[PDB]
Amino acid sequence: RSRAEYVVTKLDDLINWARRSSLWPMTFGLACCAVEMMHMAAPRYDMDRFGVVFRASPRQADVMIVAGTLTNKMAPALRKVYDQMPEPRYVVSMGSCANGGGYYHYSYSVVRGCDRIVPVDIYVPGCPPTAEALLYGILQLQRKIKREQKLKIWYRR
Amino acid sequence: VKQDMPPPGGYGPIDYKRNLPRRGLSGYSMFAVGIGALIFGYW
Amino acid sequence: MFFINILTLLVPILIAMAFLTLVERKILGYMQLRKGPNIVGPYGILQPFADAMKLFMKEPMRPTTSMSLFIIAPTLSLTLALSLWVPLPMPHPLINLNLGILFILATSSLSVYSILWSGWASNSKYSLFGALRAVAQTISYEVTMAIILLSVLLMNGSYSLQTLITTQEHMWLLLPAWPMAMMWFISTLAETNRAPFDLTEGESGFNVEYAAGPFALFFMAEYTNIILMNALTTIIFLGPLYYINLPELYSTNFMMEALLLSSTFLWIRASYPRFRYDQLMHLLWKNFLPLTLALCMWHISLPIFTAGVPPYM
Amino acid sequence: TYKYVNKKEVDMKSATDNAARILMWTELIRGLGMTLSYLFREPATINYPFEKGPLSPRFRGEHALRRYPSGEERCIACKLCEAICPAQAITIEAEPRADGSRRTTRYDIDMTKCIYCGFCQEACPVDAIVEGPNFEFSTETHEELLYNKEKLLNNGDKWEAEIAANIQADYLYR
Amino acid sequence: VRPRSDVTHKQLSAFGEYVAEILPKYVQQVQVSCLDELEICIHPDGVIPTLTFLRDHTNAQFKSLADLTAVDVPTRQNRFEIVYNLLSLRFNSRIRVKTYADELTPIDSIVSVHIAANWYEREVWDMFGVFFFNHPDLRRILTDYGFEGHPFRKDFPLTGYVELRYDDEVKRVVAEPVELAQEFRKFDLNSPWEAFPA
Amino acid sequence: NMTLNFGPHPAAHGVLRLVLELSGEMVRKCDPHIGLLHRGTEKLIEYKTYLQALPYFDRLDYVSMMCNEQAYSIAVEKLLNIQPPPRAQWIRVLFGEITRILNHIMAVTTHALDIGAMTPFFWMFEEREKMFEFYERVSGARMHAAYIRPGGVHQDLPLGLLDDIYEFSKNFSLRIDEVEEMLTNNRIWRNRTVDIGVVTAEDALNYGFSGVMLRGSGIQWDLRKTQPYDVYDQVEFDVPIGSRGDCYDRYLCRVEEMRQSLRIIEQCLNKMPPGEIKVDDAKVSPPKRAEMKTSMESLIHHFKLYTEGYQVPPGATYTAIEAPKGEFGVYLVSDGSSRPYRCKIKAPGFAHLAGLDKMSKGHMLADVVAIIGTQDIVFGEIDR
Amino acid sequence: HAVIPHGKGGRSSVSGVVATVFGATGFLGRYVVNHLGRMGSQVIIPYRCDVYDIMHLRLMGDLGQLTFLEWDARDKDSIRKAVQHSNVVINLIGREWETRNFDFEDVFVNIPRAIAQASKEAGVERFIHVSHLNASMKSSSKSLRSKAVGEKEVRSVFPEAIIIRPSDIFGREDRFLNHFANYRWFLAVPLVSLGFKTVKQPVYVADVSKGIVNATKDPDAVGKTFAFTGPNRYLLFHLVKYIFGMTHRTFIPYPLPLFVYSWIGKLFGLSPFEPWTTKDKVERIHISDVMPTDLPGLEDLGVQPTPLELKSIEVLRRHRTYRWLSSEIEETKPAKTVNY
Amino acid sequence: ITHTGQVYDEKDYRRVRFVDRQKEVNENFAIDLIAQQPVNEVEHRIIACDGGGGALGHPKVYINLDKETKTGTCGYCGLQFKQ
Ligand SMILES: CCCCCCCCCCCCCCCCCC(=O)OC[C@H](COP(=O)(O)OCCN)OC(=O)CCCCCCCCCCCCCCCCC
Ligand SMILES: NC(=O)C1=CN([C@@H]2O[C@H](COP(=O)(O)OP(=O)(O)OC[C@H]3O[C@@H](n4cnc5c(N)ncnc54)[C@H](OP(=O)(O)O)[C@@H]3O)[C@@H](O)[C@H]2O)C=CC1
Ligand SMILES: COC1=C(OC)C(=O)C(CC=C(C)C)=C(C)C1=O
Ligand code: SF4
Ligand code: SF4
Ligand SMILES: [Zn+2]
Structure with a gap:
């Protein structure tokens, strides 16, 4: 087909496939939910298998997984690093301590959620969110990206 | 009502010691094969 | 034709360059009890193309920093590495140069700048220092790297890489000169900033501020180099059998030896912790340079008193 | 009882042995052999969507509110599930239903607040609130994670068959 | 019932007198708890x-300081109760020396006696506000850089008075007075019936 | 000495604003910053009942999830003068040790990842994984179990766990052996680790190191042998003391306690008694659910225990165990109320970090990375 | 229909303003949602940009304060459901470029008239319509002339609908200030009449936003056509140089006939991806600011304007070279004010 | 609407959250389910009500079905018992 609509959608998809197949994460590793992510990186549940690299610096990172309490002192940093990433960037909040406040919600030093400091795309629940659950959450980010249609909106704009 | 307990007579024995094996070609023998290779190569 | 012969010798290497990252992310995997990337495409074959497209699409942040240099550094890194494949004598070379190994030594030396330029270009008190590590080690390892070649040449008779195919028609130059092969292999590991010798960028260099397209170009460069240096080991020390009647068994064995030695630095990476910055220079200036300079003299003496002075040409 | 982890002649045989170790990198080659060995071992990873990592009956996972077979919801709003929740997650307010029975008008588990301790599972006298097996409930928006009585009751109806099997397996232990 | 070994209760009591005699000054109310634990109390x-x-x-080597803490009894005139827990590797014993400090009456620092205290003393200043003279470098160890107020004081609100969010207008994180969306439910738990002390 | 504010994502557990002044590649002074993970754990506990503060302890240092819980347990049991039942004690030592392995696999393999060796982590994280599964099949949670409660364990072991904690133990050794063939004698591990961060014996006691860090310097102190807690007295193990204390020696010590813990686990499987896993005092331990659903005194005791609490008698205690990192102690002051008054957690780690300054002197940037590893710093325990 | 305002005034509090805001993704918009969210108002943000782009707005709103509904301008039904449950509708729908599928008249006049018609049907208490300052049906730039046509129509679809009419806006991410500063790439910075006789009065974005928000919560504004203007006027010359001044980049004002220059705008306009300059822009830029004669805006609506020099440092800092970024505004020289 | 009847009026704001979305409500509304439960006839004056399954039920209570006038209803199951 040559209708430019079918010409575009297809192109967008390719773009989405590339970003969704290779997501390079970065793990601030606040707290413990970091241990449950290292497990994902580990052999039972290989993250790489999916195209997720075990480690990445902020410049080269597609997704930031905030694992653990985002305390008030670390809150300015989180932002900095979120602000130091590329134009196509995403945030997967991991842990009840970062989805909301978690056990430490009423504390004076804990931000009640990272979505008060960085926009969050997928919220993975559980105190130590199971590694399979993170993997489920990373896979749902992949379905979120697949649906994104950036060029078709350009074309229809 | 049953309670998970060690099997009767106890379990078998486990290893708690490193079993790393000190296996290697002896040094003189190692050097001789190498020097012999260079001598043949030079000739 | 010559143009076609430029596509071949380039694309083919670029496509192979992409498949090395994949065979790195799987061989490291199986060594660490994990499948590695197999879900995108079949058995992960489409995996290298996928992040290439993700890398180019993401914003070249160009943080900000001196721009021109930020764009000369990756261009130089890819240009020199792909350029050094121009003279490799896989069977017949493409551009046969009478002083070929000096071309390879000189072109490698120029890549140290890209590290220096990228480090200065990012405006980071810390990144700037990171480039210093690589630039210093590169020239350092270059000094033994060059002397090790001079020992070789004196037993080959010329600087042209094409002569070694005639020098190694009866025996690999590993048998003789094995002591330097090892020292060429370790130096090849340093100059490609691979693991045992990858302090640079271990944490603490010249990719810090580099993302998307610039990241990719050096990136591509490193891996192409990873191959090229391994290929130079597979011509200079492991001489593939050459039959003038059928030239491809030379390239077939060149293919096999290059892949295995390329596999070896992948295997080295997973197997060893990274050396300390001074530990690294302690090796070259203390452990290797005295060995190399002395074995250099032995290779000016072996020819003369064994009446084996090599035939020029 | 103690042990010395690292507490410690020069003979050609010995030295030549030691010098070869430094010169030809003998121990380094030993390390390479180990990794080559595993390269040949079967990888332990599981296809995540197709094959799932095993979880036994006590896995706490995602909250659900059960119902009596008849169809009457088990909770009778004693509200000690609220009392023992460590994170203050469960909010319960109740009033006598027209039937005259005691039921919760609003039961809200804030899952982002919840740290999945499993004490609520423990505390309930009628065992109305249970830790359900599902762990995959990641949500695009923060509001979806906050759960009211209708989501939990719906969660309870969906997973009741497995919840009943899980409680069946572990109740003797408790 | 715990397996009390009277053998200990006595030996530690005897040391408690020993110390009380050796330092009649500065030492009062030396008592061995019913938990086989000594707690010399000093001015x-x-x-x-x-x-x-x-x-x-020689007869009492207490080389390492396990911990330095300060309970806060608001009723007590001297609010804080600095407690130093020390361990004897040689005698396999432990002892507690606890002093009292009010908010603006500083205690001496023991960084000299044990350098372990360099950090814990900073921790006590940050949380409770007691000040330690002659400390090498007193400065907040746990609280935020701009935090106002000493947090573990019983008179400090749990949630605190300030919380942080990112504001686009100013493109920077910004404190605001705390506004909580579900206040901490303060369950009253004490029962109006006591337990006849054994 | 240009401050590099070296730190946050660095090579620490997320938070180390390790601000450092470095003349080129030499470290002149290290002033670690802390509190990037302060969360209020000590103040929050004052507002919670004893049983609802148990989950906080698992989060204090969560690599060592349970061993921490044992310290609060012991502390609350002492204040009540109640002691667990015999089977529960062995359990706590069984899962106490399994947890030590879990911590050492974390400490040794994460140490290497920062050094640059990455294959040991994947090798042993698979073994870790297998252990987590024990936790899950005993507690319900992979980590953050809440299994060890103040009066014993929560629920008896599933019918079959012991057998599997055997198969694993029977093999884990080889897995430690492998790591060894990769790092103990690597011609390169030794260099980056040997003679780095040597700590004298007198200085280690002075700065309150109290852990492998002391044991590595040759001081013989294992609170598990010196002051036995639970039934660690009935087992027989050898403390792995070290000489020429340095990063390499202590490492060897941590690999040796992984070995010695397998010796303690074996015994626990061989000799765990038939019995109950929680004190029979409904006063302290919650009544069994069959009992609370058929007996009035049990419901009343279930209702009061869950809603109000233990009501510990007034007193204060400092109880220290030998958590994998080092001495973990809880000073729990308690009024007669059901909710504690103070609970300072002594973290093996607040003392160790402080030593970073006195250990990393005249050292390169890479040396600092090696020393943070040899202290097993989990910022949860330090920040509390 | 109302929501008693309870709370202390910050996030997690209630103000009772449910408001559809169709063009929130915009530079002005971003700010409008900021205050509305800060105050605690219920904000419904219709969007047709992809979800990734709308993410920045999520964090300033409290939990449940912001609802994002999809919407298409050509599809009348989408506007219908957006205003279903809103009681305040704010229209910020404009684009200075004329895109292939939406012509200047359609975005400025057709889309607002339909939107206003919908809320009269819905029963929204008040509608705020935003049109550019100095806008007359026989003016120079079509954009402005059209916008002028628009303010009229919407009055008939929605009577007593407030019509704030802002001047070109000064703010980070604005064009007025960044555009000129970005002339750096151009070696020479063309300025019609050498940047003279087009006195301009900028207005900080926030002032505009706060003003707009205050309108939503004040009975005094009905049928009012306020004009947020600014705290000081300027001949385009000082503005241009000043900008270059803070940016610390050289200035070469070059005279170039607007005749020929309208052509340069045409050139960029030709470009497919968001033309940087617009024929309609050019005229606008050299379209002199009109003296305030309409209803007073800022101050009148409760916010004291903020001088340009005060916050200019923040807007132009990124335009600056690596060096000179620590240069601060008070050591630098503030340009003179020409009221003319 | 729902078990309790939570509902939003036309003028009611706070109903927008459902716009283009769905609300969580329950079929099998319990209010009517026990009413649908037959009256457990018994012989004895008093009867128990484990809830069914002992440990997997409710803390046992004994109901006095002593007056046919009223079918005792265990406060936990809402099950009416017909003397
Ligand atoms: C008549 C005869 C005339 C000739 C006489 C010849 C006499 C016999 C030969 C003598 C020299 C033999 C060895 C030469 C190479 C080794 C030189 C050397 O000493 O290595 C340096 C270093 C030493 O280790 P270290 O402990 O740091 O130093 C101790 C002393 N300071 O070692 C290292 O640190 C190595 C680190 C290596 C990291 C990567 C390891 C990769 C291992 C696998 C690849 C091995 C090479 C494969 C080569 C394939 C073919 C090219
Ligand atoms: N900044 C300025 O130059 C000034 C502007 N104004 C007025 O204020 C209003 C806001 O200004 P500003 O924020 O700069 O404008 P923007 O250029 O930021 O655009 C405002 C919004 O309008 C939306 N929009 C544009 N075209 C369409 C369309 N065809 N259908 C649906 N939505 C559309 C855009 O959404 P999306 O991009 O997602 O499609 C954008 O979010 C403008 O309408 C303008 O008339 C007044 C004075 C100065
Ligand atoms: C030994 O310390 C470290 C951690 O704790 C184990 C981390 O979580 C992290 C975070 C990294 C991941 C992959 C969670 C780093 C970098 C680290 O150095
Ligand atoms: S959520 Fe549970 S696990 Fe993740 S950080 Fe907070 S506490 Fe640790
Ligand atoms: S405890 Fe069980 S029954 Fe009592 S309220 Fe909480 S949930 Fe409903
Ligand atoms: Zn019943």
Whole structure:
């Protein structure tokens, strides 16, 4: 087909496939939910298998997984690093301590959620969110990206 | 009502010691094969 | 034709360059009890193309920093590495140069700048220092790297890489000169900033501020180099059998030896912790340079008193 | 009882042995052999969507509110599930239903607040609130994670068959 | 019932007198808890002297400081109760020396006696506000850089008075007075019936 | 000495604003910053009942999830003068040790990842994984179990766990052996680790190191042998003391306690008694659910225990165990109320970090990375 | 229909303003949602940009304060459901470029008239319509002339609908200030009449936003056509140089006939991807600011304007070279004010 | 609407959250389910009500079905018992 609509959608998809197949994460590793992510990186549940690299610096990172309490002192940093990433960037909040406040919600030093400091795309629940659950959450980010249609909106704009 | 307990007579024995094996070609023998290779190569 | 012969010798290497990252992310995997990337495409074959497209699409942040240099550094890194494949004598070379190994030594030396330029270009008190590590080690390892070649040449008779195919028609130059092969292999590991010798960028260099397209170009460069240096080991020390009647068994064995030695630095990476910055220079200036300079003299003496002075040409 | 982890002649045989170790990198080659060995071992990873990592009956996972077979919801709003929740997650307010029975008008588990301790599972006298097996409930928006009585009751109806099997397996232990 | 070994209760009691005699000054109310634990109590001025004797005495070597803490009894005139828990590797024993400090009456620092205290003393200042003279470098260890107020004081609100969010207008994180969306439910738990003390 | 504010994502557990002044590649002074993970754990506990503060302890240092819980347990049991039942004690030592392995696999393999060796982590994280599964099949949670409660364990072991904690133990050794063939004698591990961060014996006691860090310097102190807690007295193990204390020696010590813990686990499987896993005092331990659903005194005791609490008698205690990192102690002051008054957690780690300054002197940037590893710093325990 | 305002005034509090805001993704918009969210108002943000782009707005709103509904301008039904449950509708729908599928008249006049018609049907208490300052049906730039046509129509679809009419806006991410500063790439910075006789009065974005928000919560504004203007006027010359001044980049004002220059705008306009300059822009830029004669805006609506020099440092800092970024505004020289 | 009847009026704001979305409500509304439960006839004056399954039920209570006038209803199951 040559209708430019079918010409575009297809192109967008390719773009989405590339970003969704290779997501390079970065793990601030606040707290413990970091241990449950290292497990994902580990052999039972290989993250790489999916195209997720075990480690990445902020410049080269597609997704930031905030694992653990985002305390008030670390809150300015989180932002900095979120602000130091590329134009196509995403945030997967991991842990009840970062989805909301978690056990430490009423504390004076804990931000009640990272979505008060960085926009969050997928919220993975559980105190130590199971590694399979993170993997489920990373896979749902992949379905979120697949649906994104950036060029078709350009074309229809 | 049953309670998970060690099997009767106890379990078998486990290893708690490193079993790393000190296996290697002896040094003189190692050097001789190498020097012999260079001598043949030079000739 | 010559143009076609430029596509071949380039694309083919670029496509192979992409498949090395994949065979790195799987061989490291199986060594660490994990499948590695197999879900995108079949058995992960489409995996290298996928992040290439993700890398180019993401914003070249160009943080900000001196721009021109930020764009000369990756261009130089890819240009020199792909350029050094121009003279490799896989069977017949493409551009046969009478002083070929000096071309390879000189072109490698120029890549140290890209590290220096990228480090200065990012405006980071810390990144700037990171480039210093690589630039210093590169020239350092270059000094033994060059002397090790001079020992070789004196037993080959010329600087042209094409002569070694005639020098190694009866025996690999590993048998003789094995002591330097090892020292060429370790130096090849340093100059490609691979693991045992990858302090640079271990944490603490010249990719810090580099993302998307610039990241990719050096990136591509490193891996192409990873191959090229391994290929130079597979011509200079492991001489593939050459039959003038059928030239491809030379390239077939060149293919096999290059892949295995390329596999070896992948295997080295997973197997060893990274050396300390001074530990690294302690090796070259203390452990290797005295060995190399002395074995250099032995290779000016072996020819003369064994009446084996090599035939020029 | 103690042990010395690292507490410690020069003979050609010995030295030549030691010098070869430094010169030809003998121990380094030993390390390479180990990794080559595993390269040949079967990888332990599981296809995540197709094959799932095993979880036994006590896995706490995602909250659900059960119902009596008849169809009457088990909770009778004693509200000690609220009392023992460590994170203050469960909010319960109740009033006598027209039937005259005691039921919760609003039961809200804030899952982002919840740290999945499993004490609520423990505390309930009628065992109305249970830790359900599902762990995959990641949500695009923060509001979806906050759960009211209708989501939990719906969660309870969906997973009741497995919840009943899980409680069946572990109740003797408790 | 715990497996009490009276053998201990006595030996530690005997040491408690020993110390009380050795330092009649600065030491009062020395008592061995029913938990086979000694808790010499010293006047705040005896901080340096009592510790040093325990760190360097042949019959009582208490080389490492397990912990330095400050309970806060608001009722007590001297609000804080600095407690130093010390361990004897040689005698396989432990002792507690606890002093009292009010908010603006500083205690001496023992960084000299044990350098372990360099950090814990900073921790006590940050949380409770007690000040330690002669400290090498007192400065907040746990609280935020701009935090106002000492948090573990019983008179400090749990949620605190400030919380942080990112504001686009100013493109920077910004404190605001705390506004909570579900206040901490303050369950009253004490029962109006006591337990006849054994 | 240009401050590099070296730190946050660095090579620490997320938070180390390790601000450092470095003349080129030499470290002149290290002033670690802390509190990037302060969360209020000590103040929050004052507002919670004893049983609802148990989950906080698992989060204090969560690599060592349970061993921490044992310290609060012991502390609350002492204040009540109640002691667990015999089977529960062995359990706590069984899962106490399994947890030590879990911590050492974390400490040794994460140490290497920062050094640059990455294959040991994947090798042993698979073994870790297998252990987590024990936790899950005993507690319900992979980590953050809440299994060890103040009066014993929560629920008896599933019918079959012991057998599997055997198969694993029977093999784990080889897995430690492998790591060894990769790092103990690597011609390169030794260099980056040997003679780095040597700590004298007198200085280690002075700065309150109290852990492998002391044991590595040759001081013989294992609170598990010196002051036995639970039934660690009935087992027989050898403390792995070290000489020429340095990063390499202590490492060897941590690999040796992984070995010695397998010796303690074996015994626990061989000799765990038939019995109950929680004190029979409904006063302290919650009544069994069959009992609370058929007996009035049990419901009343279930209702009061869950809603109000233990009501510990007034007193204060400092109880220290030998958590994998080092001495973990809880000073729990308690009024007669059901909710504690103070609970300072002594973290093996607040003392160790402080030593970073006195250990990393005249050292390169890479040396600092090696020393943070040899202290097993989990910022949860330090920040509390 | 109302929501008693309870709370202390910050996030997690209630103000009772449910408001559809169709063009929130915009530079002005971003700010409008900021205050509305800060105040605690219920904000419904219709969007047709992809979800990734709308993410920045999520964090300033409290939980449940912001609802994002999809919407298409050509599809009348989408506007219908957006205003279903809103009681305040704010229209910020404009684009200075004329895109292939939406012509200047359609975005400025057709889309607002339909939107206003919908809320009269819905029963929204008040509608705020935003049109550019100095806008007359026989003016120079079509954009402005059209916008002028628009303010009229919407009055008939929605009577007593407030019509704030802002001047070109000064703010980070604005064009007025960044555009000129970005002339750096151009070696020479063309300025019609050498940047003279086009006195301009900028207005900080926030002032505009706060003003707009205050309108939503004040009975005094009905049928009012306020004009947020600014705290000081300027001949385009000082503005241009000043900008270059803070940016610390050289200035070469070059005279170039607007005749020929309208052509340069045409050139960029030709470009497919968001033309940087617009024929309609050019005229606008050299379209002199009109003296305030309409209803007073800022101050009148409760916010004291903020001088340009005060916050200019923040807007132009990124335009600056690596060096000179620590240069601060008070050591630098503030340009003179020409009221003319 | 729902078990309790939570509902939003036309003028009611706070109903927008459902716009283009769905609300969580329950079929099998319990209010009517026990009413649908037959009256457990018994012989004895008093009867128990484990809830069914003992440990897997409710803390046992004994109901006095002593007056046919009223079918005792265990406060936990809402099950009416017909003497
Ligand atoms: C008549 C005869 C005339 C000739 C006489 C010849 C006499 C016999 C030969 C003598 C020299 C033999 C060895 C030469 C190479 C080794 C030189 C050397 O000493 O290595 C340096 C270093 C030493 O280790 P270290 O402990 O740091 O130093 C101790 C002393 N300071 O070692 C290292 O640190 C190595 C680190 C290596 C990291 C990567 C390891 C990769 C291992 C696998 C690849 C091995 C090479 C494969 C080569 C394939 C073919 C090219
Ligand atoms: N900044 C300025 O130059 C000034 C502007 N104004 C007025 O204020 C209003 C806001 O200004 P500003 O924020 O700069 O404008 P923007 O250029 O930021 O655009 C405002 C919004 O309008 C939306 N929009 C544009 N075209 C369409 C369309 N065809 N259908 C649906 N939505 C559309 C855009 O959404 P999306 O991009 O997602 O499609 C954008 O979010 C403008 O309408 C303008 O008339 C007044 C004075 C100065
Ligand atoms: C030994 O310390 C470290 C951690 O704790 C184990 C981390 O979580 C992290 C975070 C990294 C991941 C992959 C969670 C780093 C970098 C680290 O150095
Ligand atoms: S959520 Fe549970 S696990 Fe993740 S950080 Fe907070 S506490 Fe640790
Ligand atoms: S405890 Fe069980 S029954 Fe009592 S309220 Fe909480 S949930 Fe409903
Ligand atoms: Zn019943």
